[PDB]
């Protein structure tokens, strides 16, 4: 009993070498891949994807390991849940749809896949939008007392298995609801469609899914950081035109001024705050959809 | 579920204070020496060194306020009872109930945070101070980087507002306490611990009220404790009590440290010695820890 939050969108299970990507597909026009983050699934886009779908071929994918996407078995370097590996798998997924050049909008973890995709394979991207993130490198580099308290989960979920898994397994409902609520402007679940929450909660109820998220965060503490580190110390900037959007009360703005930071990572970045917490497309759907439509359109 | 008396010869004292009772095992005679445990332990963590100290001292092995069998004072929005300043004042009162207004103090982990805060707040209470495998709380936070945030993640995790840490710790409390114990040893397993000691730790950690107190401790450690430490750094206040800083070669002090170098910024007279041990010096390396403590404290 999970609601269909994308009425009239198709359903694709896209085979890749690293497992199937699930995706809702709707609209027509240039291809726009939408990527969710933690602790969500592709359904987080349900309030903005229909507006995008009047303009673009919208592909709302579950991340590798998330939602209904297959979970590749991780390893000691958390390789398939590195953003590099996730980006490559999603590139593969898009190629299976005939999409070798596409627009990309990512939120949270999916935004981390997105900018890593833009660094690793910029030729795959027409335009990039990242929602309420700074590069992983920048979070760790700004990880002082205040910020370590603010995003403790970056260090907690990165603890070696099975420590976060075992703590999360006692009452997974509480944690997924806690993280959803804590990062919203309001600080509760009012911003979210209850049917969306059920998708997130059900995905989080699966211990393998939770393990994937921890592996995602372990990758985020280790390989992802190291990959970002190489690029920023090499002066490798994202050449793809990109939009950095962030919630005024979101997470990105807690570490630093997001546009300043992204200008260090991207030679063609525009930015705009939106009055929202972290979950821009659900807390601020119209404003997010308008900002994305405007930026991806000509 | 029966435990184990790991201090044969020692008495058992519930010390009344204005914030609740402090449990302590008391043995030996001579100059008073208070032994303070840390997280996630109880007084019984001293069971392998306290006999050797009891050869020369009246050894008071106390459960920290809110820990073990000590009473748990009601907390507040500022976690005041579990700030190290309030814990030190409560232990000062405990010690006063025994006639000890001037004592030696060895602290480990949280108890060492109590102990150096006690030395900053009430240095006249202490003849000599020994802290085991800590740097000041201010230092941990000021050194907070990616590497530190990952290694001492629990400093930020347990400091999250209630009931997030409590609800998660509830998910598998037995695992968590054992993982903390094992992950901070040199061996990486429970093999350094007396299983009777581990059972003490597991049973205390099994109580949600006890786990709450521990989070209250770390919440203080992220806020009030850090602020209190900050006032001293910025005022140049140094610990004047003769200090010994022991740390494990593989412990939670050496990482971003040379702990003696850090501690010299905090104390005018501090000696230091690495101990071949992880974080749990009195259990991983009892003879070495006891010898260093005995050598440092033997005078008075």
Coordinates of C-alpha atoms in Angstrom, one line a residue:
Chain A
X1 CA 0.0 0.0 0.0
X2 CA 2.3 2.8 -1.3
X3 CA 0.7 5.7 -3.1
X4 CA 1.5 6.6 -6.7
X5 CA 2.7 10.2 -6.3
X6 CA 3.5 10.7 -10.0
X7 CA 0.1 10.2 -11.8
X8 CA 0.6 9.5 -15.4
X9 CA 4.4 9.0 -15.0
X10 CA 5.7 5.8 -16.4
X11 CA 7.7 3.2 -14.4
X12 CA 11.1 2.0 -15.6
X13 CA 13.5 -0.5 -14.0
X14 CA 16.7 0.4 -15.8
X15 CA 19.3 -2.4 -15.9
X16 CA 22.9 -1.3 -15.3
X17 CA 26.1 -3.3 -14.7
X18 CA 25.6 -2.4 -11.0
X19 CA 22.0 -3.3 -10.7
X20 CA 18.6 -1.9 -11.7
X21 CA 17.7 1.7 -11.2
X22 CA 14.1 2.4 -10.6
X23 CA 12.7 5.5 -12.0
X24 CA 9.5 7.3 -12.7
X25 CA 9.5 8.8 -16.2
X26 CA 7.1 11.4 -17.5
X27 CA 6.9 14.4 -19.7
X28 CA 8.6 15.1 -23.0
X29 CA 11.4 17.3 -24.1
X30 CA 15.1 17.4 -23.1
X31 CA 16.0 14.7 -20.6
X32 CA 16.0 15.8 -17.0
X33 CA 17.3 13.4 -14.4
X34 CA 16.1 14.1 -10.8
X35 CA 18.0 12.5 -7.9
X36 CA 16.8 12.4 -4.3
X37 CA 18.9 12.1 -1.2
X38 CA 18.7 10.8 2.3
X39 CA 16.5 9.6 3.9
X40 CA 14.3 9.7 0.9
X41 CA 13.4 8.1 -2.4
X42 CA 12.6 9.5 -5.8
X43 CA 9.1 10.4 -4.6
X44 CA 10.5 13.5 -2.9
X45 CA 10.2 15.0 -6.4
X46 CA 6.4 14.4 -6.6
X47 CA 5.5 18.1 -6.1
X48 CA 8.0 19.5 -8.6
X49 CA 8.4 16.8 -11.2
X50 CA 4.9 17.4 -12.8
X51 CA 5.8 21.1 -13.4
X52 CA 9.1 19.9 -14.9
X53 CA 7.3 17.3 -16.9
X54 CA 5.5 20.0 -19.0
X55 CA 9.0 21.1 -20.3
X56 CA 11.3 18.1 -20.0
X57 CA 11.5 14.3 -20.2
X58 CA 11.7 13.9 -16.4
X59 CA 13.4 10.9 -15.1
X60 CA 12.9 10.6 -11.3
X61 CA 15.3 7.9 -10.2
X62 CA 15.9 6.1 -7.0
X63 CA 19.6 6.3 -6.2
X64 CA 21.6 3.1 -6.4
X65 CA 20.7 1.2 -3.3
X66 CA 17.8 3.4 -2.4
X67 CA 14.0 3.1 -2.8
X68 CA 13.3 0.4 -5.3
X69 CA 16.7 0.5 -7.0
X70 CA 18.8 -2.6 -6.5
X71 CA 21.4 -2.5 -3.8
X72 CA 24.8 -3.5 -5.1
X73 CA 26.8 -5.4 -2.4
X74 CA 29.2 -2.9 -0.8
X75 CA 32.8 -3.6 0.1
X76 CA 35.4 -2.2 2.5
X77 CA 35.8 1.0 0.5
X78 CA 32.0 1.3 0.2
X79 CA 32.7 1.5 -3.5
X80 CA 29.2 1.3 -5.2
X81 CA 27.9 3.9 -2.8
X82 CA 30.6 6.4 -3.6
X83 CA 29.1 9.2 -5.6
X84 CA 31.7 8.4 -8.3
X85 CA 30.3 4.9 -8.6
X86 CA 26.7 6.1 -8.3
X87 CA 27.3 8.7 -11.0
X88 CA 28.7 6.1 -13.3
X89 CA 25.8 3.7 -12.7
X90 CA 23.3 6.5 -13.3
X91 CA 25.2 7.5 -16.5
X92 CA 24.7 3.8 -17.5
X93 CA 21.0 4.0 -16.6
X94 CA 20.5 7.1 -18.7
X95 CA 22.4 5.5 -21.6
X96 CA 20.0 2.6 -21.5
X97 CA 17.3 5.2 -22.2
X98 CA 19.3 6.7 -25.1
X99 CA 20.3 9.7 -22.9
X100 CA 24.0 10.5 -23.2
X101 CA 23.5 14.2 -22.6
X102 CA 21.0 15.3 -20.1
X103 CA 20.0 17.9 -17.5
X104 CA 20.6 16.8 -13.9
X105 CA 19.0 18.1 -10.6
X106 CA 20.0 16.4 -7.4
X107 CA 19.0 16.9 -3.8
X108 CA 21.1 15.9 -0.8
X109 CA 23.0 12.6 -1.6
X110 CA 21.7 12.8 -5.2
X111 CA 23.2 16.3 -5.5
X112 CA 26.5 14.8 -4.3
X113 CA 26.2 12.2 -7.1
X114 CA 25.3 15.0 -9.4
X115 CA 28.3 17.3 -8.9
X116 CA 30.6 14.3 -8.8
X117 CA 29.0 13.3 -12.1
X118 CA 29.7 16.8 -13.4
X119 CA 33.3 16.5 -12.3
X120 CA 33.9 13.0 -13.6
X121 CA 31.9 13.1 -16.8
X122 CA 31.0 16.7 -17.5
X123 CA 30.2 15.9 -21.1
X124 CA 27.2 13.9 -19.9
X125 CA 25.5 17.0 -18.6
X126 CA 23.8 19.9 -20.3
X127 CA 23.0 21.7 -17.0
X128 CA 23.4 20.8 -13.4
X129 CA 21.3 21.8 -10.4
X130 CA 22.3 20.9 -6.8
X131 CA 19.8 21.4 -4.0
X132 CA 20.8 22.4 -0.5
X133 CA 24.4 20.9 -0.5
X134 CA 27.9 22.0 -0.6
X135 CA 30.5 19.5 -1.9
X136 CA 31.2 16.7 0.6
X137 CA 34.8 18.0 0.9
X138 CA 33.5 21.3 2.1
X139 CA 31.3 19.8 4.8
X140 CA 34.2 17.9 6.3
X141 CA 36.5 20.9 5.9
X142 CA 34.1 23.0 7.9
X143 CA 33.4 20.3 10.5
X144 CA 34.0 22.3 13.6
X145 CA 32.1 21.9 16.9
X146 CA 29.0 23.7 15.8
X147 CA 28.8 21.9 12.5
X148 CA 29.7 18.5 13.9
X149 CA 26.8 18.9 16.2
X150 CA 24.6 20.1 13.4
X151 CA 25.3 17.2 11.0
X152 CA 26.4 14.6 13.6
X153 CA 24.8 12.0 11.3
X154 CA 27.7 12.6 8.8
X155 CA 30.0 11.1 11.5
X156 CA 27.5 8.8 13.1
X157 CA 26.3 7.0 10.0
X158 CA 29.9 6.7 8.8
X159 CA 30.8 4.6 11.9
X160 CA 31.9 1.1 10.9
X161 CA 29.2 -1.4 10.4
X162 CA 27.2 -2.6 12.2
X163 CA 27.2 0.2 14.8
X164 CA 24.8 2.7 13.1
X165 CA 22.8 -0.3 11.6
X166 CA 22.3 -1.8 15.0
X167 CA 21.2 1.4 16.6
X168 CA 18.9 2.3 13.7
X169 CA 17.4 -1.2 13.8
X170 CA 15.6 -0.7 17.1
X171 CA 13.2 1.9 16.0
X172 CA 13.8 2.9 12.3
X173 CA 10.5 4.7 12.0
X174 CA 11.7 7.2 14.7
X175 CA 15.0 8.0 13.0
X176 CA 13.7 8.5 9.5
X177 CA 10.9 10.6 10.8
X178 CA 13.4 12.4 13.0
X179 CA 15.7 13.3 10.1
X180 CA 12.8 14.3 7.9
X181 CA 11.4 16.6 10.6
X182 CA 14.6 18.0 12.0
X183 CA 15.8 19.3 8.6
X184 CA 12.6 21.1 7.7
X185 CA 12.0 24.8 8.3
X186 CA 9.1 24.0 10.6
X187 CA 10.9 21.1 12.4
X188 CA 8.1 18.6 12.0
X189 CA 6.5 16.5 9.2
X190 CA 3.9 19.1 8.1
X191 CA 5.9 20.0 4.9
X192 CA 5.7 16.4 3.6
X193 CA 2.8 14.7 1.9
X194 CA 1.9 11.8 4.3
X195 CA 2.0 9.5 1.3
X196 CA 5.5 10.6 0.6
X197 CA 6.5 10.0 4.3
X198 CA 5.2 6.4 3.9
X199 CA 7.5 5.8 1.0
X200 CA 10.5 7.1 3.0
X201 CA 9.4 5.2 6.1
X202 CA 8.9 1.9 4.3
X203 CA 12.2 2.2 2.5
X204 CA 13.9 2.9 5.8
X205 CA 12.2 -0.1 7.5
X206 CA 14.3 -2.4 5.4
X207 CA 17.6 -3.2 7.2
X208 CA 19.4 -3.6 3.9
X209 CA 18.2 -0.2 2.7
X210 CA 19.5 1.3 6.0
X211 CA 22.8 -0.4 5.5
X212 CA 23.0 1.1 2.0
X213 CA 22.5 4.6 3.5
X214 CA 25.2 4.0 6.0
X215 CA 27.5 2.8 3.2
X216 CA 26.5 6.0 1.4
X217 CA 27.6 8.0 4.5
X218 CA 30.7 5.8 4.9
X219 CA 31.6 6.6 1.3
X220 CA 30.8 10.2 2.2
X221 CA 33.3 10.2 5.0
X222 CA 36.0 8.4 3.1
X223 CA 36.2 7.8 -0.7
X224 CA 33.8 10.7 -1.6
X225 CA 35.9 13.1 0.6
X226 CA 39.1 11.8 -1.0
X227 CA 37.7 12.2 -4.6
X228 CA 36.5 15.7 -3.8
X229 CA 39.9 16.4 -2.1
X230 CA 41.7 15.5 -5.3
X231 CA 39.6 17.8 -7.4
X232 CA 39.7 20.9 -5.2
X233 CA 43.4 20.5 -4.6
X234 CA 43.9 20.1 -8.3
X235 CA 41.7 23.1 -9.0
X236 CA 39.3 21.0 -11.0
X237 CA 36.1 23.0 -11.4
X238 CA 32.7 21.8 -12.7
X239 CA 32.5 23.3 -16.3
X240 CA 28.8 22.5 -16.7
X241 CA 26.5 25.5 -16.1
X242 CA 25.1 24.9 -12.7
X243 CA 22.4 26.2 -10.4
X244 CA 23.0 25.9 -6.6
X245 CA 19.8 26.2 -4.7
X246 CA 19.6 26.0 -1.0
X247 CA 17.1 26.5 1.9
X248 CA 17.6 29.6 4.0
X249 CA 17.1 27.2 6.9
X250 CA 18.7 24.3 5.1
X251 CA 21.9 22.5 5.8
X252 CA 24.2 23.9 3.1
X253 CA 23.9 27.5 4.5
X254 CA 24.9 26.4 8.0
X255 CA 28.5 25.7 7.0
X256 CA 29.2 28.7 4.8
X257 CA 27.7 31.1 2.2
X258 CA 26.7 28.5 -0.4
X259 CA 27.3 30.5 -3.6
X260 CA 30.8 31.6 -2.5
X261 CA 31.7 27.9 -1.9
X262 CA 30.2 26.7 -5.2
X263 CA 32.1 29.4 -7.1
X264 CA 35.2 27.6 -6.0
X265 CA 33.9 24.3 -7.5
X266 CA 32.2 25.6 -10.6
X267 CA 33.2 28.1 -13.3
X268 CA 29.5 28.8 -14.3
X269 CA 27.4 28.7 -11.2
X270 CA 24.3 30.7 -10.3
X271 CA 22.7 30.5 -6.9
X272 CA 19.5 31.4 -5.1
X273 CA 18.2 30.8 -1.6
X274 CA 14.7 29.6 -1.1
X275 CA 12.8 30.1 2.1
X276 CA 12.8 26.4 3.1
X277 CA 14.6 23.9 5.2
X278 CA 16.6 21.2 3.6
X279 CA 13.8 19.6 1.6
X280 CA 13.4 22.3 -1.0
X281 CA 11.1 20.3 -3.4
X282 CA 8.6 19.4 -0.7
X283 CA 8.9 22.4 1.6
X284 CA 9.0 24.9 -1.3
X285 CA 7.7 23.0 -4.3
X286 CA 6.5 26.0 -6.4
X287 CA 9.6 28.1 -5.8
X288 CA 11.9 25.1 -6.4
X289 CA 10.0 24.0 -9.5
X290 CA 10.1 27.6 -10.8
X291 CA 13.8 28.0 -10.2
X292 CA 14.6 24.6 -11.9
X293 CA 12.3 25.3 -14.9
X294 CA 13.8 28.7 -15.4
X295 CA 17.4 27.5 -15.1
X296 CA 16.9 24.4 -17.3
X297 CA 14.8 26.2 -19.9
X298 CA 15.9 28.5 -22.7
Chain B
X1 CA 21.2 -10.7 37.5
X2 CA 23.9 -10.8 40.2
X3 CA 27.2 -9.0 39.7
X4 CA 30.7 -9.4 41.1
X5 CA 32.6 -7.8 44.0
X6 CA 35.7 -6.7 42.2
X7 CA 37.2 -4.8 45.2
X8 CA 37.8 -7.5 47.9
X9 CA 38.6 -5.7 51.1
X10 CA 36.9 -2.5 50.1
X11 CA 33.9 -1.2 51.8
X12 CA 30.8 0.2 50.1
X13 CA 29.8 3.8 50.9
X14 CA 26.7 5.7 49.8
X15 CA 27.9 9.3 50.3
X16 CA 25.1 11.8 50.7
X17 CA 25.3 15.0 48.8
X18 CA 22.9 17.9 48.1
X19 CA 22.4 16.5 44.6
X20 CA 22.1 12.9 45.5
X21 CA 24.1 9.9 46.7
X22 CA 27.6 9.1 45.3
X23 CA 28.4 5.4 45.4
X24 CA 31.9 4.5 46.3
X25 CA 34.0 1.5 47.1
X26 CA 36.5 2.5 49.8
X27 CA 39.6 0.6 50.8
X28 CA 43.1 1.2 52.0
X29 CA 44.4 3.9 54.3
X30 CA 46.7 6.8 54.2
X31 CA 46.2 10.0 52.1
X32 CA 42.8 10.1 50.4
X33 CA 42.8 9.3 46.7
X34 CA 39.6 9.6 44.7
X35 CA 39.3 7.5 41.5
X36 CA 36.9 8.7 38.9
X37 CA 35.7 6.5 36.0
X38 CA 34.4 7.6 32.7
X39 CA 32.1 6.5 29.9
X40 CA 30.7 4.0 29.4
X41 CA 31.9 2.5 32.6
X42 CA 31.4 2.6 36.4
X43 CA 33.8 2.7 39.3
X44 CA 34.6 -1.0 38.8
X45 CA 36.9 0.0 35.9
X46 CA 39.5 0.7 38.7
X47 CA 39.3 -2.9 40.0
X48 CA 42.8 -3.8 38.7
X49 CA 44.7 -0.7 39.9
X50 CA 42.8 0.3 43.1
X51 CA 44.2 -2.6 45.2
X52 CA 47.7 -1.4 44.3
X53 CA 46.8 2.1 45.2
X54 CA 45.1 0.9 48.4
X55 CA 48.6 -0.2 49.5
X56 CA 49.4 3.4 50.1
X57 CA 46.2 5.5 50.0
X58 CA 42.7 5.6 51.2
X59 CA 41.3 4.8 47.8
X60 CA 37.8 6.1 47.1
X61 CA 36.4 4.5 43.9
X62 CA 33.3 6.5 43.2
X63 CA 30.6 6.2 40.6
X64 CA 30.2 9.6 38.9
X65 CA 27.0 11.5 39.5
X66 CA 24.3 9.8 37.4
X67 CA 26.6 6.8 36.7
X68 CA 26.7 3.3 38.1
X69 CA 24.9 3.3 41.5
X70 CA 25.3 7.0 42.2
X71 CA 22.0 8.8 42.3
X72 CA 20.9 10.6 39.1
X73 CA 20.1 14.2 39.9
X74 CA 17.3 15.5 37.7
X75 CA 18.8 17.3 34.7
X76 CA 17.6 20.6 33.2
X77 CA 17.8 22.4 29.9
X78 CA 21.5 23.2 30.5
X79 CA 22.3 19.7 31.6
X80 CA 23.7 21.5 34.7
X81 CA 24.0 18.5 37.0
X82 CA 26.2 16.6 34.5
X83 CA 28.4 19.5 33.6
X84 CA 31.9 18.7 34.9
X85 CA 31.7 21.8 37.1
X86 CA 28.6 20.6 38.9
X87 CA 29.9 17.0 39.0
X88 CA 33.2 18.3 40.6
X89 CA 31.2 20.3 43.1
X90 CA 29.1 17.3 44.0
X91 CA 32.2 15.1 44.5
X92 CA 33.8 17.8 46.5
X93 CA 30.7 17.6 48.8
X94 CA 31.0 13.8 48.8
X95 CA 34.6 14.0 49.8
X96 CA 33.7 16.5 52.5
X97 CA 31.2 14.0 53.9
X98 CA 34.3 11.8 54.5
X99 CA 36.4 14.5 56.0
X100 CA 38.5 14.8 52.8
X101 CA 38.8 18.4 51.8
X102 CA 42.3 17.9 50.4
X103 CA 42.7 14.7 48.3
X104 CA 44.5 13.2 45.4
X105 CA 42.4 12.6 42.3
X106 CA 42.9 10.3 39.4
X107 CA 40.3 10.5 36.6
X108 CA 39.7 8.6 33.4
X109 CA 37.5 9.7 30.5
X110 CA 34.5 11.7 31.9
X111 CA 35.9 11.4 35.4
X112 CA 39.1 13.0 34.2
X113 CA 37.0 15.9 32.7
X114 CA 35.5 16.2 36.2
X115 CA 38.9 16.0 37.6
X116 CA 40.6 18.8 35.6
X117 CA 37.6 20.9 35.9
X118 CA 37.7 20.4 39.7
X119 CA 41.4 21.4 39.5
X120 CA 40.5 24.6 37.7
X121 CA 37.5 25.5 39.9
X122 CA 38.8 24.3 43.3
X123 CA 42.5 23.7 43.0
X124 CA 43.0 23.9 46.8
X125 CA 40.9 20.7 47.0
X126 CA 43.6 18.6 45.3
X127 CA 47.1 17.6 46.4
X128 CA 47.8 16.0 43.0
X129 CA 45.8 15.3 39.9
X130 CA 46.1 12.5 37.4
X131 CA 44.1 12.4 34.2
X132 CA 44.0 9.3 32.1
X133 CA 43.7 9.4 28.3
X134 CA 41.9 12.8 27.9
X135 CA 42.7 16.2 26.7
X136 CA 40.5 19.1 28.0
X137 CA 37.1 19.2 26.4
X138 CA 37.9 22.5 24.9
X139 CA 40.8 20.9 23.0
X140 CA 38.7 18.0 21.5
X141 CA 36.2 20.6 20.1
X142 CA 38.8 23.1 19.0
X143 CA 40.5 20.2 17.2
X144 CA 37.2 19.1 15.7
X145 CA 37.9 18.2 12.1
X146 CA 36.8 15.4 9.8
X147 CA 39.3 13.0 11.4
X148 CA 38.3 13.8 15.0
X149 CA 34.5 13.9 14.2
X150 CA 34.8 10.4 12.9
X151 CA 36.9 9.0 15.7
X152 CA 35.0 10.6 18.6
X153 CA 31.6 10.8 16.7
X154 CA 29.8 10.0 20.0
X155 CA 30.7 13.5 21.3
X156 CA 28.4 14.9 18.7
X157 CA 26.0 11.9 18.5
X158 CA 25.2 11.7 22.2
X159 CA 25.0 15.5 22.5
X160 CA 22.0 15.6 20.1
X161 CA 18.8 16.8 21.8
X162 CA 16.8 14.2 23.6
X163 CA 15.5 11.7 22.8
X164 CA 17.4 11.1 19.6
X165 CA 20.6 9.6 21.2
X166 CA 18.5 7.8 23.9
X167 CA 16.1 6.3 21.3
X168 CA 19.0 5.0 19.2
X169 CA 21.0 3.7 22.1
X170 CA 17.8 1.9 23.1
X171 CA 17.9 0.1 19.7
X172 CA 20.8 -2.1 20.9
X173 CA 22.2 -0.9 24.3
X174 CA 24.2 -4.1 25.0
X175 CA 25.9 -3.9 21.6
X176 CA 26.7 -0.3 21.9
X177 CA 28.3 -0.5 25.3
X178 CA 30.4 -3.5 24.2
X179 CA 31.3 -1.8 20.9
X180 CA 32.5 1.3 22.8
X181 CA 34.5 -0.9 25.2
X182 CA 36.0 -3.0 22.4
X183 CA 36.5 -0.3 19.8
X184 CA 38.7 1.9 22.1
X185 CA 41.0 -0.9 23.3
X186 CA 44.3 -1.7 21.7
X187 CA 42.9 -5.2 20.9
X188 CA 39.7 -4.0 19.5
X189 CA 37.7 -6.7 21.3
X190 CA 36.6 -7.3 24.9
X191 CA 39.6 -9.4 25.8
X192 CA 41.3 -6.7 27.9
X193 CA 38.3 -6.5 30.3
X194 CA 37.4 -8.7 33.2
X195 CA 34.1 -10.2 32.1
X196 CA 32.7 -9.4 35.5
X197 CA 33.7 -5.8 34.9
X198 CA 32.0 -5.9 31.5
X199 CA 28.8 -7.1 33.2
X200 CA 28.8 -4.1 35.5
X201 CA 29.1 -1.8 32.5
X202 CA 26.4 -3.7 30.5
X203 CA 23.9 -3.6 33.4
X204 CA 24.4 0.1 34.0
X205 CA 24.1 0.7 30.3
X206 CA 21.0 -1.5 30.2
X207 CA 19.0 1.2 32.2
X208 CA 17.5 3.9 30.0
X209 CA 17.7 6.4 32.8
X210 CA 21.5 5.7 33.0
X211 CA 21.9 6.1 29.3
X212 CA 20.0 9.4 29.5
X213 CA 22.4 10.7 32.1
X214 CA 25.3 9.7 29.9
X215 CA 23.8 11.7 27.0
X216 CA 23.3 14.5 29.5
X217 CA 27.0 14.2 30.3
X218 CA 27.9 14.5 26.6
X219 CA 25.4 17.3 26.1
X220 CA 27.1 19.2 28.9
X221 CA 30.4 18.2 27.2
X222 CA 29.3 19.9 24.0
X223 CA 27.9 23.0 25.6
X224 CA 28.4 24.2 29.2
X225 CA 31.6 22.1 29.7
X226 CA 33.1 23.6 26.6
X227 CA 32.1 27.1 27.6
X228 CA 33.6 26.7 31.1
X229 CA 36.8 25.4 29.5
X230 CA 36.7 28.4 27.1
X231 CA 36.6 30.9 29.9
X232 CA 39.8 29.4 31.4
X233 CA 41.6 29.3 28.0
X234 CA 40.8 32.9 27.3
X235 CA 41.6 34.0 30.9
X236 CA 44.9 32.0 30.9
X237 CA 43.8 30.0 33.9
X238 CA 46.2 27.1 34.4
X239 CA 45.9 24.1 36.7
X240 CA 48.3 24.7 39.5
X241 CA 48.0 21.3 41.1
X242 CA 50.8 18.8 40.3
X243 CA 49.4 16.9 37.3
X244 CA 50.1 13.6 35.7
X245 CA 48.7 13.0 32.2
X246 CA 48.6 9.4 31.2
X247 CA 47.4 8.4 27.7
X248 CA 47.2 5.2 25.7
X249 CA 49.5 4.9 22.7
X250 CA 46.3 3.8 20.9
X251 CA 43.9 5.8 23.1
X252 CA 41.5 8.8 22.9
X253 CA 44.1 11.5 23.5
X254 CA 47.0 10.9 21.2
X255 CA 45.8 11.7 17.7
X256 CA 45.8 15.5 17.5
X257 CA 47.9 16.0 20.7
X258 CA 51.1 15.0 22.0
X259 CA 48.9 15.2 25.1
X260 CA 51.7 16.5 27.4
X261 CA 52.2 19.4 25.0
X262 CA 48.5 20.1 25.1
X263 CA 48.3 19.7 28.8
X264 CA 51.2 22.0 29.5
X265 CA 49.0 24.8 28.0
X266 CA 46.5 23.9 30.7
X267 CA 48.6 23.1 33.7
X268 CA 51.8 24.7 35.1
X269 CA 53.2 21.4 36.5
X270 CA 52.3 18.3 34.4
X271 CA 54.2 15.2 33.8
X272 CA 53.2 12.8 31.1
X273 CA 53.7 9.2 30.1
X274 CA 52.3 7.1 27.2
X275 CA 50.9 3.8 28.4
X276 CA 51.0 0.7 26.1
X277 CA 47.2 0.6 26.0
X278 CA 44.1 1.7 24.2
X279 CA 41.8 4.1 26.0
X280 CA 41.1 1.9 29.0
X281 CA 44.4 2.3 30.7
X282 CA 43.4 0.8 34.1
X283 CA 42.1 -2.3 32.5
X284 CA 44.3 -2.7 29.4
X285 CA 47.5 -1.9 31.3
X286 CA 46.8 -2.0 35.0
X287 CA 50.4 -2.7 36.3
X288 CA 51.8 0.1 34.1
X289 CA 49.0 2.5 35.0
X290 CA 49.1 1.6 38.7
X291 CA 52.9 2.0 38.8
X292 CA 52.8 5.4 37.1
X293 CA 49.9 6.5 39.5
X294 CA 51.7 5.1 42.6
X295 CA 54.9 6.8 41.6
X296 CA 53.2 10.1 40.9
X297 CA 50.9 10.2 44.0
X298 CA 53.3 8.7 46.6
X299 CA 54.3 11.6 48.8
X300 CA 51.6 13.7 50.7

